[PDB]
Short mmCIF file of N, CA and C in Angstrom, two decimals:
data_model
loop_
_atom_site.label_atom_id
_atom_site.label_comp_id
_atom_site.label_asym_id
_atom_site.label_seq_id
_atom_site.Cartn_x
_atom_site.Cartn_y
_atom_site.Cartn_z
N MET A 108 11.79 -59.19 -18.72
CA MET A 108 12.68 -59.48 -17.56
C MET A 108 12.43 -58.56 -16.36
N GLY A 109 11.73 -57.44 -16.55
CA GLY A 109 11.47 -56.37 -15.57
C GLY A 109 10.33 -55.48 -16.04
N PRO A 110 9.91 -54.45 -15.26
CA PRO A 110 8.69 -53.68 -15.54
C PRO A 110 8.72 -52.88 -16.86
N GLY A 111 9.92 -52.54 -17.33
CA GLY A 111 10.12 -51.89 -18.64
C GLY A 111 9.72 -52.83 -19.76
N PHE A 112 10.25 -54.05 -19.72
CA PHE A 112 9.92 -55.09 -20.73
C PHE A 112 8.46 -55.50 -20.62
N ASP A 113 7.88 -55.45 -19.42
CA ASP A 113 6.43 -55.74 -19.20
C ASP A 113 5.56 -54.73 -19.97
N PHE A 114 5.82 -53.44 -19.83
CA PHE A 114 5.04 -52.40 -20.56
C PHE A 114 5.26 -52.56 -22.07
N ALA A 115 6.51 -52.75 -22.50
CA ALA A 115 6.83 -52.91 -23.93
C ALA A 115 6.04 -54.08 -24.50
N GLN A 116 6.04 -55.22 -23.80
CA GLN A 116 5.36 -56.45 -24.30
C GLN A 116 3.86 -56.19 -24.42
N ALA A 117 3.28 -55.49 -23.46
CA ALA A 117 1.82 -55.18 -23.45
C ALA A 117 1.46 -54.37 -24.70
N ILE A 118 2.31 -53.43 -25.08
CA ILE A 118 2.10 -52.62 -26.32
C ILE A 118 2.29 -53.52 -27.53
N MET A 119 3.36 -54.33 -27.58
CA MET A 119 3.59 -55.14 -28.79
C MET A 119 2.45 -56.11 -29.02
N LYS A 120 1.94 -56.73 -27.96
CA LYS A 120 0.97 -57.86 -28.12
C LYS A 120 -0.38 -57.38 -28.64
N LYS A 121 -0.74 -56.12 -28.44
CA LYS A 121 -2.08 -55.62 -28.81
C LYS A 121 -2.04 -54.50 -29.86
N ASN A 122 -0.96 -53.73 -29.94
CA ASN A 122 -0.97 -52.47 -30.72
C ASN A 122 0.06 -52.49 -31.86
N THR A 123 0.56 -53.64 -32.29
CA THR A 123 1.47 -53.65 -33.46
C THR A 123 0.94 -54.61 -34.52
N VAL A 124 1.27 -54.28 -35.77
CA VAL A 124 1.04 -55.15 -36.94
C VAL A 124 2.35 -55.16 -37.72
N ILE A 125 2.49 -56.13 -38.60
CA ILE A 125 3.59 -56.14 -39.58
C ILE A 125 3.09 -55.43 -40.85
N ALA A 126 3.70 -54.30 -41.19
CA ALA A 126 3.36 -53.55 -42.42
C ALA A 126 4.41 -53.85 -43.49
N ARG A 127 3.96 -54.16 -44.71
CA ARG A 127 4.87 -54.35 -45.86
C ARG A 127 4.50 -53.36 -46.96
N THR A 128 5.49 -52.56 -47.37
CA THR A 128 5.40 -51.66 -48.54
C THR A 128 6.42 -52.18 -49.57
N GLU A 129 6.55 -51.48 -50.70
CA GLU A 129 7.60 -51.79 -51.72
C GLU A 129 9.00 -51.52 -51.19
N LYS A 130 9.14 -50.82 -50.06
CA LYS A 130 10.44 -50.47 -49.43
C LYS A 130 10.79 -51.44 -48.29
N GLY A 131 9.95 -52.44 -47.97
CA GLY A 131 10.27 -53.50 -47.00
C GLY A 131 9.17 -53.80 -46.00
N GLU A 132 9.54 -54.57 -44.97
CA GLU A 132 8.69 -54.94 -43.82
C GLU A 132 9.04 -54.03 -42.65
N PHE A 133 8.03 -53.45 -42.00
CA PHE A 133 8.23 -52.52 -40.86
C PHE A 133 7.33 -52.95 -39.70
N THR A 134 7.83 -52.81 -38.48
CA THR A 134 6.96 -52.74 -37.29
C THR A 134 6.05 -51.51 -37.51
N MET A 135 4.77 -51.66 -37.24
CA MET A 135 3.79 -50.55 -37.35
C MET A 135 2.99 -50.51 -36.05
N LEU A 136 2.95 -49.33 -35.43
CA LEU A 136 2.24 -49.07 -34.15
C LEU A 136 0.82 -48.55 -34.45
N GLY A 137 -0.19 -49.33 -34.05
CA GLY A 137 -1.60 -48.88 -34.06
C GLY A 137 -1.85 -48.00 -32.85
N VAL A 138 -2.53 -46.86 -33.02
CA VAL A 138 -2.66 -45.86 -31.92
C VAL A 138 -4.10 -45.85 -31.41
N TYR A 139 -5.08 -45.82 -32.32
CA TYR A 139 -6.51 -45.83 -31.93
C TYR A 139 -7.31 -46.06 -33.20
N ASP A 140 -8.53 -46.59 -33.06
CA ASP A 140 -9.46 -46.82 -34.20
C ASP A 140 -8.66 -47.56 -35.30
N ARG A 141 -8.60 -47.06 -36.54
CA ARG A 141 -7.84 -47.76 -37.63
C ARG A 141 -6.60 -46.92 -37.97
N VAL A 142 -6.12 -46.13 -37.03
CA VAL A 142 -5.01 -45.15 -37.26
C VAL A 142 -3.72 -45.74 -36.70
N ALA A 143 -2.69 -45.81 -37.56
CA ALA A 143 -1.36 -46.32 -37.18
C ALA A 143 -0.28 -45.32 -37.62
N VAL A 144 0.95 -45.58 -37.21
CA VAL A 144 2.12 -44.77 -37.64
C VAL A 144 3.18 -45.69 -38.27
N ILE A 145 4.03 -45.09 -39.09
CA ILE A 145 5.15 -45.82 -39.76
C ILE A 145 6.17 -44.77 -40.15
N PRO A 146 7.48 -45.10 -40.27
CA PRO A 146 8.43 -44.10 -40.78
C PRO A 146 8.03 -43.65 -42.19
N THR A 147 8.23 -42.36 -42.47
CA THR A 147 7.85 -41.78 -43.77
C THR A 147 8.66 -42.43 -44.91
N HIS A 148 9.88 -42.87 -44.64
CA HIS A 148 10.71 -43.55 -45.67
C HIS A 148 10.14 -44.92 -46.07
N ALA A 149 9.13 -45.44 -45.38
CA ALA A 149 8.37 -46.64 -45.84
C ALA A 149 7.64 -46.37 -47.16
N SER A 150 7.39 -45.11 -47.53
CA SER A 150 6.73 -44.68 -48.80
C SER A 150 5.37 -45.37 -48.96
N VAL A 151 4.48 -45.16 -48.01
CA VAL A 151 3.13 -45.80 -48.03
C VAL A 151 2.40 -45.35 -49.29
N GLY A 152 1.75 -46.28 -50.00
CA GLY A 152 0.92 -45.96 -51.18
C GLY A 152 -0.56 -46.12 -50.91
N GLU A 153 -1.31 -46.42 -51.96
CA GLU A 153 -2.77 -46.62 -51.96
C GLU A 153 -3.12 -47.98 -51.34
N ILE A 154 -2.21 -48.95 -51.44
CA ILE A 154 -2.33 -50.34 -50.92
C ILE A 154 -1.09 -50.67 -50.06
N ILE A 155 -1.31 -51.35 -48.94
CA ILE A 155 -0.25 -51.81 -48.03
C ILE A 155 -0.62 -53.25 -47.61
N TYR A 156 0.37 -54.07 -47.24
CA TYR A 156 0.11 -55.40 -46.64
C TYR A 156 0.18 -55.25 -45.12
N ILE A 157 -0.84 -55.73 -44.40
CA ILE A 157 -0.93 -55.69 -42.92
C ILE A 157 -1.04 -57.15 -42.46
N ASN A 158 0.01 -57.70 -41.82
CA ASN A 158 0.02 -59.14 -41.45
C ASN A 158 -0.30 -59.98 -42.70
N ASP A 159 0.26 -59.61 -43.85
CA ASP A 159 0.22 -60.33 -45.15
C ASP A 159 -1.18 -60.29 -45.78
N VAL A 160 -2.04 -59.37 -45.35
CA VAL A 160 -3.40 -59.12 -45.90
C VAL A 160 -3.34 -57.81 -46.71
N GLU A 161 -3.73 -57.89 -47.98
CA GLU A 161 -3.88 -56.71 -48.87
C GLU A 161 -4.89 -55.74 -48.28
N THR A 162 -4.48 -54.50 -48.01
CA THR A 162 -5.32 -53.52 -47.27
C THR A 162 -5.31 -52.17 -48.00
N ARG A 163 -6.47 -51.59 -48.24
CA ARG A 163 -6.53 -50.23 -48.81
C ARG A 163 -6.11 -49.22 -47.76
N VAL A 164 -5.34 -48.23 -48.18
CA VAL A 164 -4.99 -47.05 -47.35
C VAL A 164 -6.06 -45.98 -47.56
N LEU A 165 -6.79 -45.63 -46.52
CA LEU A 165 -7.90 -44.64 -46.62
C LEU A 165 -7.34 -43.23 -46.57
N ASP A 166 -6.21 -43.01 -45.88
CA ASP A 166 -5.54 -41.70 -45.79
C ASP A 166 -4.10 -41.93 -45.32
N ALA A 167 -3.16 -41.12 -45.78
CA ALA A 167 -1.76 -41.18 -45.32
C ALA A 167 -1.19 -39.76 -45.29
N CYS A 168 -0.62 -39.34 -44.17
CA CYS A 168 -0.12 -37.96 -44.06
C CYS A 168 1.30 -37.97 -43.46
N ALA A 169 2.29 -37.57 -44.26
CA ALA A 169 3.69 -37.35 -43.83
C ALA A 169 3.77 -36.07 -43.02
N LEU A 170 4.03 -36.17 -41.72
CA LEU A 170 3.99 -34.99 -40.82
C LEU A 170 5.24 -34.15 -41.02
N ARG A 171 5.06 -32.84 -40.91
CA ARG A 171 6.15 -31.84 -40.91
C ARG A 171 5.85 -30.85 -39.79
N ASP A 172 6.86 -30.25 -39.17
CA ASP A 172 6.60 -29.21 -38.16
C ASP A 172 6.22 -27.89 -38.85
N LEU A 173 5.90 -26.89 -38.04
CA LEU A 173 5.40 -25.60 -38.57
C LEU A 173 6.54 -24.77 -39.17
N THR A 174 7.81 -25.15 -39.00
CA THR A 174 8.92 -24.64 -39.88
C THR A 174 8.97 -25.40 -41.23
N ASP A 175 8.05 -26.33 -41.50
CA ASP A 175 7.96 -27.13 -42.74
C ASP A 175 9.23 -28.00 -42.82
N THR A 176 9.64 -28.58 -41.68
CA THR A 176 10.77 -29.55 -41.57
C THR A 176 10.21 -30.97 -41.36
N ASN A 177 10.75 -31.92 -42.08
CA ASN A 177 10.36 -33.35 -41.96
C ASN A 177 10.33 -33.77 -40.48
N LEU A 178 9.30 -34.54 -40.07
CA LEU A 178 9.31 -35.24 -38.74
C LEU A 178 9.54 -36.77 -38.87
N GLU A 179 9.44 -37.31 -40.08
CA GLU A 179 9.72 -38.74 -40.42
C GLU A 179 8.61 -39.65 -39.91
N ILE A 180 7.47 -39.09 -39.49
CA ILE A 180 6.28 -39.88 -39.07
C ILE A 180 5.24 -39.76 -40.20
N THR A 181 4.72 -40.90 -40.67
CA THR A 181 3.50 -40.92 -41.52
C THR A 181 2.35 -41.53 -40.69
N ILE A 182 1.23 -40.83 -40.63
CA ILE A 182 -0.02 -41.33 -40.00
C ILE A 182 -0.85 -41.96 -41.10
N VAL A 183 -1.23 -43.21 -40.88
CA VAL A 183 -1.98 -44.00 -41.88
C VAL A 183 -3.34 -44.35 -41.30
N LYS A 184 -4.41 -44.17 -42.07
CA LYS A 184 -5.70 -44.76 -41.72
C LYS A 184 -5.92 -45.98 -42.61
N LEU A 185 -6.15 -47.14 -42.02
CA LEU A 185 -6.21 -48.45 -42.71
C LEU A 185 -7.68 -48.86 -42.92
N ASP A 186 -8.01 -49.37 -44.09
CA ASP A 186 -9.33 -50.03 -44.33
C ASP A 186 -9.34 -51.44 -43.73
N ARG A 187 -9.25 -51.50 -42.40
CA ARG A 187 -9.17 -52.75 -41.62
C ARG A 187 -10.53 -52.98 -40.94
N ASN A 188 -10.89 -54.25 -40.70
CA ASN A 188 -12.20 -54.61 -40.12
C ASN A 188 -12.18 -54.59 -38.60
N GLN A 189 -11.11 -54.10 -37.97
CA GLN A 189 -10.95 -54.21 -36.51
C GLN A 189 -10.25 -52.92 -36.04
N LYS A 190 -10.65 -52.38 -34.90
CA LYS A 190 -9.95 -51.23 -34.28
C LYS A 190 -8.80 -51.68 -33.37
N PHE A 191 -7.82 -50.79 -33.22
CA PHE A 191 -6.73 -50.91 -32.22
C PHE A 191 -7.28 -50.49 -30.87
N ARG A 192 -6.75 -51.12 -29.84
CA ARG A 192 -6.87 -50.56 -28.47
C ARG A 192 -6.38 -49.11 -28.48
N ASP A 193 -7.13 -48.20 -27.90
CA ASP A 193 -6.76 -46.77 -27.83
C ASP A 193 -5.65 -46.60 -26.79
N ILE A 194 -4.44 -46.25 -27.24
CA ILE A 194 -3.24 -46.02 -26.36
C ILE A 194 -2.84 -44.56 -26.36
N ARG A 195 -3.70 -43.64 -26.81
CA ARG A 195 -3.29 -42.21 -26.87
C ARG A 195 -2.96 -41.67 -25.47
N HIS A 196 -3.54 -42.20 -24.40
CA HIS A 196 -3.24 -41.71 -23.02
C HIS A 196 -1.82 -42.10 -22.59
N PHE A 197 -1.09 -42.93 -23.36
CA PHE A 197 0.33 -43.28 -23.07
C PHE A 197 1.31 -42.38 -23.84
N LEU A 198 0.80 -41.45 -24.66
CA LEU A 198 1.67 -40.55 -25.47
C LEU A 198 2.05 -39.32 -24.64
N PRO A 199 3.33 -38.92 -24.69
CA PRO A 199 3.78 -37.67 -24.08
C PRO A 199 3.11 -36.45 -24.69
N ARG A 200 2.93 -35.41 -23.88
CA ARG A 200 2.38 -34.16 -24.42
C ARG A 200 3.48 -33.24 -24.94
N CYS A 201 4.71 -33.34 -24.41
CA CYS A 201 5.80 -32.40 -24.75
C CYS A 201 7.09 -33.15 -25.12
N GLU A 202 8.00 -32.45 -25.80
CA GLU A 202 9.36 -32.94 -26.13
C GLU A 202 10.10 -33.13 -24.80
N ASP A 203 10.85 -34.21 -24.64
CA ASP A 203 11.48 -34.53 -23.34
C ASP A 203 12.63 -35.51 -23.55
N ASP A 204 13.46 -35.62 -22.53
CA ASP A 204 14.49 -36.68 -22.36
C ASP A 204 13.88 -37.75 -21.46
N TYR A 205 14.41 -38.96 -21.52
CA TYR A 205 13.86 -40.13 -20.79
C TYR A 205 14.98 -40.99 -20.23
N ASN A 206 14.69 -41.70 -19.15
CA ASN A 206 15.59 -42.79 -18.69
C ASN A 206 14.99 -44.16 -19.05
N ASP A 207 15.88 -45.11 -19.30
CA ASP A 207 15.61 -46.57 -19.21
C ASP A 207 14.51 -46.92 -20.21
N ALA A 208 14.77 -46.70 -21.50
CA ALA A 208 13.81 -47.03 -22.58
C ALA A 208 14.09 -48.42 -23.16
N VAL A 209 13.07 -49.00 -23.79
CA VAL A 209 13.12 -50.29 -24.53
C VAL A 209 12.68 -49.98 -25.95
N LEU A 210 13.40 -50.54 -26.91
CA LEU A 210 13.03 -50.54 -28.34
C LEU A 210 12.53 -51.93 -28.66
N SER A 211 11.28 -52.05 -29.13
CA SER A 211 10.66 -53.37 -29.43
C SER A 211 10.27 -53.47 -30.91
N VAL A 212 10.62 -54.60 -31.52
CA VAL A 212 10.46 -54.87 -32.97
C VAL A 212 9.72 -56.18 -33.16
N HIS A 213 8.84 -56.23 -34.13
CA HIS A 213 8.19 -57.49 -34.51
C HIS A 213 8.04 -57.56 -36.03
N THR A 214 8.93 -58.31 -36.69
CA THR A 214 8.85 -58.56 -38.15
C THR A 214 9.13 -60.04 -38.40
N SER A 215 8.94 -60.51 -39.65
CA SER A 215 9.39 -61.87 -40.10
C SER A 215 10.88 -62.09 -39.75
N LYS A 216 11.72 -61.08 -39.92
CA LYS A 216 13.19 -61.15 -39.70
C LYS A 216 13.52 -61.13 -38.20
N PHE A 217 12.83 -60.27 -37.43
CA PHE A 217 13.09 -60.05 -35.99
C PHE A 217 11.81 -60.19 -35.18
N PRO A 218 11.28 -61.42 -34.98
CA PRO A 218 10.09 -61.62 -34.15
C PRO A 218 10.38 -61.49 -32.65
N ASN A 219 9.46 -60.84 -31.92
CA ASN A 219 9.51 -60.79 -30.44
C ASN A 219 10.88 -60.30 -29.97
N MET A 220 11.39 -59.23 -30.58
CA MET A 220 12.68 -58.60 -30.24
C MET A 220 12.49 -57.39 -29.30
N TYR A 221 13.23 -57.35 -28.19
CA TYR A 221 13.21 -56.27 -27.18
C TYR A 221 14.66 -55.88 -26.87
N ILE A 222 14.99 -54.60 -26.95
CA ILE A 222 16.37 -54.08 -26.71
C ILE A 222 16.30 -53.03 -25.62
N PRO A 223 16.99 -53.19 -24.47
CA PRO A 223 17.10 -52.13 -23.48
C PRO A 223 18.13 -51.12 -24.01
N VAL A 224 17.68 -49.94 -24.41
CA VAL A 224 18.57 -48.95 -25.09
C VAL A 224 19.10 -47.94 -24.08
N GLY A 225 18.55 -47.85 -22.87
CA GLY A 225 19.04 -47.00 -21.79
C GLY A 225 18.53 -45.59 -21.91
N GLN A 226 19.40 -44.62 -21.67
CA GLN A 226 19.05 -43.17 -21.64
C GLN A 226 18.70 -42.67 -23.05
N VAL A 227 17.65 -41.87 -23.13
CA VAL A 227 17.16 -41.27 -24.41
C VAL A 227 17.30 -39.74 -24.32
N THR A 228 18.11 -39.14 -25.20
CA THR A 228 18.34 -37.69 -25.31
C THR A 228 17.33 -37.05 -26.28
N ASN A 229 16.74 -35.92 -25.91
CA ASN A 229 16.06 -35.01 -26.86
C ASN A 229 17.15 -34.39 -27.72
N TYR A 230 17.44 -35.00 -28.85
CA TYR A 230 18.59 -34.65 -29.72
C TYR A 230 18.21 -33.45 -30.59
N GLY A 231 16.97 -33.45 -31.07
CA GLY A 231 16.41 -32.37 -31.89
C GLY A 231 16.70 -32.56 -33.35
N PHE A 232 17.62 -31.75 -33.89
CA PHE A 232 17.90 -31.72 -35.35
C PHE A 232 18.81 -32.89 -35.70
N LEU A 233 18.48 -33.58 -36.79
CA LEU A 233 19.32 -34.63 -37.41
C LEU A 233 19.18 -34.54 -38.92
N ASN A 234 20.31 -34.63 -39.61
CA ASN A 234 20.34 -34.88 -41.07
C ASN A 234 20.20 -36.38 -41.28
N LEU A 235 18.99 -36.86 -41.53
CA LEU A 235 18.63 -38.29 -41.57
C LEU A 235 18.58 -38.74 -43.03
N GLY A 236 19.59 -39.50 -43.48
CA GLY A 236 19.64 -39.91 -44.90
C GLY A 236 19.65 -38.71 -45.83
N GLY A 237 20.30 -37.61 -45.46
CA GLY A 237 20.29 -36.38 -46.29
C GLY A 237 19.09 -35.45 -46.06
N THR A 238 18.10 -35.82 -45.24
CA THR A 238 16.87 -35.00 -45.05
C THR A 238 16.91 -34.32 -43.69
N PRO A 239 16.94 -32.96 -43.59
CA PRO A 239 16.87 -32.27 -42.31
C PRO A 239 15.59 -32.74 -41.58
N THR A 240 15.74 -33.16 -40.35
CA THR A 240 14.65 -33.80 -39.56
C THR A 240 14.64 -33.19 -38.16
N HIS A 241 13.46 -32.88 -37.61
CA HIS A 241 13.34 -32.36 -36.24
C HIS A 241 12.71 -33.41 -35.30
N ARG A 242 12.71 -33.07 -34.01
CA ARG A 242 12.11 -33.89 -32.91
C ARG A 242 12.69 -35.30 -32.87
N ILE A 243 14.00 -35.42 -33.03
CA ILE A 243 14.71 -36.72 -32.95
C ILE A 243 15.13 -36.99 -31.51
N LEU A 244 14.86 -38.23 -31.09
CA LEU A 244 15.34 -38.83 -29.84
C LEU A 244 16.57 -39.68 -30.18
N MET A 245 17.58 -39.71 -29.31
CA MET A 245 18.81 -40.51 -29.60
C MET A 245 19.10 -41.45 -28.43
N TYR A 246 19.57 -42.65 -28.74
CA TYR A 246 19.98 -43.66 -27.73
C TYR A 246 21.26 -44.32 -28.21
N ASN A 247 22.09 -44.74 -27.26
CA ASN A 247 23.45 -45.25 -27.58
C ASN A 247 23.34 -46.76 -27.72
N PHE A 248 22.70 -47.23 -28.78
CA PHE A 248 22.68 -48.68 -29.14
C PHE A 248 22.90 -48.80 -30.64
N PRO A 249 23.78 -49.74 -31.08
CA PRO A 249 24.03 -50.02 -32.49
C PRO A 249 22.88 -50.77 -33.18
N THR A 250 21.79 -50.04 -33.41
CA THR A 250 20.59 -50.51 -34.16
C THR A 250 20.97 -50.81 -35.62
N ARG A 251 20.19 -51.68 -36.28
CA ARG A 251 20.49 -52.26 -37.62
C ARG A 251 19.25 -52.21 -38.49
N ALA A 252 19.48 -52.33 -39.79
CA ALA A 252 18.44 -52.59 -40.81
C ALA A 252 17.51 -53.68 -40.26
N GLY A 253 16.21 -53.42 -40.37
CA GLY A 253 15.13 -54.30 -39.88
C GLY A 253 14.41 -53.73 -38.66
N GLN A 254 14.98 -52.71 -37.99
CA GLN A 254 14.41 -52.19 -36.71
C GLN A 254 13.56 -50.94 -36.96
N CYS A 255 13.50 -50.43 -38.19
CA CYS A 255 12.74 -49.17 -38.46
C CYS A 255 11.27 -49.45 -38.19
N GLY A 256 10.65 -48.51 -37.47
CA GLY A 256 9.24 -48.61 -37.06
C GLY A 256 9.15 -49.21 -35.66
N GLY A 257 10.27 -49.69 -35.12
CA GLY A 257 10.31 -50.27 -33.77
C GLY A 257 9.75 -49.28 -32.78
N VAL A 258 9.07 -49.75 -31.76
CA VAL A 258 8.42 -48.86 -30.77
C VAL A 258 9.38 -48.60 -29.62
N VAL A 259 9.54 -47.33 -29.28
CA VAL A 259 10.35 -46.90 -28.10
C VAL A 259 9.41 -46.57 -26.95
N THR A 260 9.57 -47.28 -25.82
CA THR A 260 8.72 -47.08 -24.63
C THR A 260 9.60 -46.86 -23.39
N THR A 261 9.03 -46.19 -22.41
CA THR A 261 9.45 -46.32 -20.99
C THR A 261 8.28 -46.96 -20.25
N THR A 262 8.43 -47.26 -18.95
CA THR A 262 7.26 -47.66 -18.13
C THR A 262 6.22 -46.53 -18.24
N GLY A 263 5.06 -46.87 -18.77
CA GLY A 263 3.88 -46.03 -18.81
C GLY A 263 3.84 -45.12 -20.00
N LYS A 264 4.91 -45.00 -20.83
CA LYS A 264 4.87 -44.07 -21.99
C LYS A 264 5.38 -44.68 -23.30
N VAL A 265 4.66 -44.38 -24.38
CA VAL A 265 5.07 -44.71 -25.77
C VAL A 265 5.62 -43.42 -26.36
N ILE A 266 6.95 -43.35 -26.58
CA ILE A 266 7.61 -42.03 -26.77
C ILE A 266 8.08 -41.82 -28.21
N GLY A 267 8.22 -42.86 -29.03
CA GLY A 267 8.80 -42.68 -30.37
C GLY A 267 8.74 -43.95 -31.21
N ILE A 268 9.12 -43.80 -32.48
CA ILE A 268 9.31 -44.94 -33.40
C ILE A 268 10.70 -44.79 -34.04
N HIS A 269 11.45 -45.89 -34.06
CA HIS A 269 12.82 -45.98 -34.60
C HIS A 269 12.83 -45.62 -36.10
N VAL A 270 13.72 -44.70 -36.53
CA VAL A 270 13.73 -44.24 -37.95
C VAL A 270 15.15 -44.32 -38.53
N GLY A 271 16.19 -44.55 -37.72
CA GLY A 271 17.55 -44.68 -38.28
C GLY A 271 18.66 -44.88 -37.28
N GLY A 272 19.90 -44.95 -37.79
CA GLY A 272 21.07 -45.15 -36.92
C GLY A 272 22.34 -44.79 -37.66
N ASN A 273 23.46 -44.65 -36.95
CA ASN A 273 24.77 -44.35 -37.59
C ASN A 273 25.80 -45.45 -37.28
N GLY A 274 25.37 -46.63 -36.83
CA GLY A 274 26.25 -47.74 -36.42
C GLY A 274 26.53 -47.79 -34.92
N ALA A 275 26.64 -46.65 -34.23
CA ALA A 275 26.87 -46.56 -32.77
C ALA A 275 25.61 -46.09 -32.02
N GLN A 276 24.90 -45.13 -32.62
CA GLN A 276 23.65 -44.54 -32.07
C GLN A 276 22.42 -44.96 -32.90
N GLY A 277 21.25 -44.95 -32.25
CA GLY A 277 19.94 -45.12 -32.91
C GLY A 277 19.11 -43.87 -32.68
N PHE A 278 18.22 -43.60 -33.61
CA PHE A 278 17.39 -42.37 -33.65
C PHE A 278 15.91 -42.74 -33.82
N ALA A 279 15.07 -42.06 -33.03
CA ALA A 279 13.62 -42.28 -33.11
C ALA A 279 12.94 -40.94 -33.36
N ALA A 280 11.83 -40.95 -34.07
CA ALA A 280 10.93 -39.76 -34.20
C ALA A 280 10.00 -39.73 -33.00
N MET A 281 9.88 -38.59 -32.33
CA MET A 281 8.92 -38.41 -31.21
C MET A 281 7.51 -38.74 -31.64
N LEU A 282 6.77 -39.36 -30.73
CA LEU A 282 5.29 -39.36 -30.80
C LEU A 282 4.78 -38.38 -29.73
N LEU A 283 3.89 -37.51 -30.13
CA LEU A 283 3.24 -36.52 -29.26
C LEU A 283 1.73 -36.72 -29.31
N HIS A 284 1.09 -36.54 -28.17
CA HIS A 284 -0.39 -36.67 -28.06
C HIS A 284 -1.10 -35.82 -29.14
N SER A 285 -0.57 -34.63 -29.42
CA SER A 285 -1.20 -33.65 -30.34
C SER A 285 -1.25 -34.15 -31.78
N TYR A 286 -0.45 -35.15 -32.18
CA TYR A 286 -0.53 -35.71 -33.54
C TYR A 286 -1.86 -36.47 -33.74
N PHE A 287 -2.53 -36.91 -32.67
CA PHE A 287 -3.64 -37.91 -32.76
C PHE A 287 -4.94 -37.42 -32.11
N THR A 288 -5.10 -36.11 -32.02
CA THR A 288 -6.40 -35.47 -31.70
C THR A 288 -7.30 -35.66 -32.94
N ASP A 289 -8.53 -36.17 -32.73
CA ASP A 289 -9.50 -36.56 -33.80
C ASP A 289 -10.57 -35.46 -33.92
#
């Protein structure tokens, strides 16, 4: 409907796949080459379904900060026959607050879904499902089951992936450029 939804759609149309684990279907953001991200609670194993294709996982790493605190991001390298468009130049370098963000989801349950979530706070610490978690972004939208892995964007930046909610607020894990230096 506007330039925010334009940037979000450009990311969804080229840089997302539907990932299925034993814990459900997730939006999955491809970042570069065969490297993607997913919430750590997806519990990625040796095999994952990518757009309903059985795919070997070549590597999977649950990120933690240097205080050894959960970040809720898992970086996956996929045994896929095709590379993602490289979007690392759209990743923030530092922790920040944002205006006018969109949360975008693409699953069997929620195809072509875009939510204007508004202002995004650098919230920091969250007890997420009982797990102390750092680098959390917060937005005042009542997000629901099915939106985990959703991509959070502003115009020109891919800033996070949706990892939870409390019924009134939604929470995303930061994406930082430094996670994807090769």
